[PDB]
Design a protein around this ligand. Structure first.
Ligand SMILES: [Ca+2]
Ligand SMILES: [Zn+2]
Ligand SMILES: [Zn+2]
Lengths: 217, 217
């Protein structure tokens, strides 16, 4: 089931990738395309090279110039399209840690990376922040000042999950602290976009804190 | 986690393998190892070829001889190990339809197949039967009389669930009538094994019928 792209705010589109996993069923994966006039920025690649191809087609069929992607942590559902973007000379970004994690796992690396706990993509359009470990040791979040959207990636859990998801790379006892660090930014959050599941409100943060503290206990 | 095998009756061992990551996390999937003396029959392979190897190694380290496997539908959670067993000259069985389906999606095929709605494996150790399309167009069930244990695969759910999993390759249209047949066999059921989740009892079945209206309505 191929890639779906839908407008969720002015200049912000939710892109959703799917798999049919035999034995489980339908799973989805979210990222964003953020536009700045005709420039397009990808927050997380679709889950596969093929769906990453469809996302670029989506952009070029609309005449958008894809300027860069940013991936929120090293897992395959965040980075599967980095290699294809690299072959198209489209700058790809992760944090330094995510990049070095990919490199260690023998995966394609972004051509660019950022060193501090905060960075910007699109010259202020996208604010990135590392709040601490949770879902992974390297997970970062993206704040969109204009649309008032926090892309939480997998550090956040949508309202239809009651588990933290895959925790083999997780720091469960760190996670709730890391969400509080996001809370401390006092972002005027209108919408939180999780890496999987439905978009919700700032409520998603509290729901994630509950999940983490309960798992940590 | 790697493979888990645990005795659930005399000469029967529930084997559980685990598929990872997703937005969901760990999911289990069950098959059985059935022993007649030192002769072992596998009902459903593990979910990867790596976990299949371990199930075999598990078998061989105990000086059991693996006689055959049977997969209960074409799905990878039922059939992923078929490639491996073939390479060990261990007979692999499915229904004739399941083999053609496997062939049809270009997947490894069993070396053996039965053609009618029923077939028995291992001098009465296992009876197989095709009750109709449900979970998939091709799913079958297996029954053990000595250990009084039913393996239902994904044609049945697990009380710990109220859903059904993927229903696109399915026929909820057919499902309900694909499962008013198993109780009529009048197996003395001590134990019922779904393809996913906790081992249950003969309370496990009826369940699946009302779940198959939920989507048929
Ligand atoms: Ca990237
Ligand atoms: Zn992840
Ligand atoms: Zn199935």
């Amino acid at each position: 089931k191929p890639l779906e792209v839908i407008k969720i705010e002015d200049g912000v589109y939710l892109h959703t990738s799917f798999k049919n996993i035999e034995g489980y069923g339908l799973v989805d994966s979210n990222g964003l395309v953020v536009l700045d006039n005709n420039q397009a920025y990808i927050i997380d690649t679709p889950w596969s090279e093929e769906d990453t191809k469809l996302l670029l087609s989506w952009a070029t069929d609309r005449g958008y110039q894809v300027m860069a992607s940013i991936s929120t942590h090293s897992h395959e559902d965040r980075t599967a399209g980095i290699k294809l973007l690299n072959s198209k000379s489209i700058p790809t970004y992760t944090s330094e840690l995510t990049k070095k994690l990919l490199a260690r796992e023998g995966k394609p690396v972004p051509t660019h990376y950022f060193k501090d706990d905060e960075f910007t993509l699109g010259n202020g359009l996208i604010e990135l922040y590392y709040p601490g470990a949770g879902h992974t040791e390297d997970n970062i979040v993206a704040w969109l000042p204009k649309s008032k959207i926090l892309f939480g990636g997998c550090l956040v859990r949508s309202h239809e999950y009651e588990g933290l998801g895959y925790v083999g790379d997780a720091s469960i006892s760190s996670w709730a602290d890391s969400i509080k660090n996001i809370v401390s930014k006092k972002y005027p959050i209108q919408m939180v976009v999780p890496g999987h599941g439905k978009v919700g409100s700032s409520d998603i943060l509290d729901h994630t804190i509950d999940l983490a503290e309960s798992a940590s206990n």
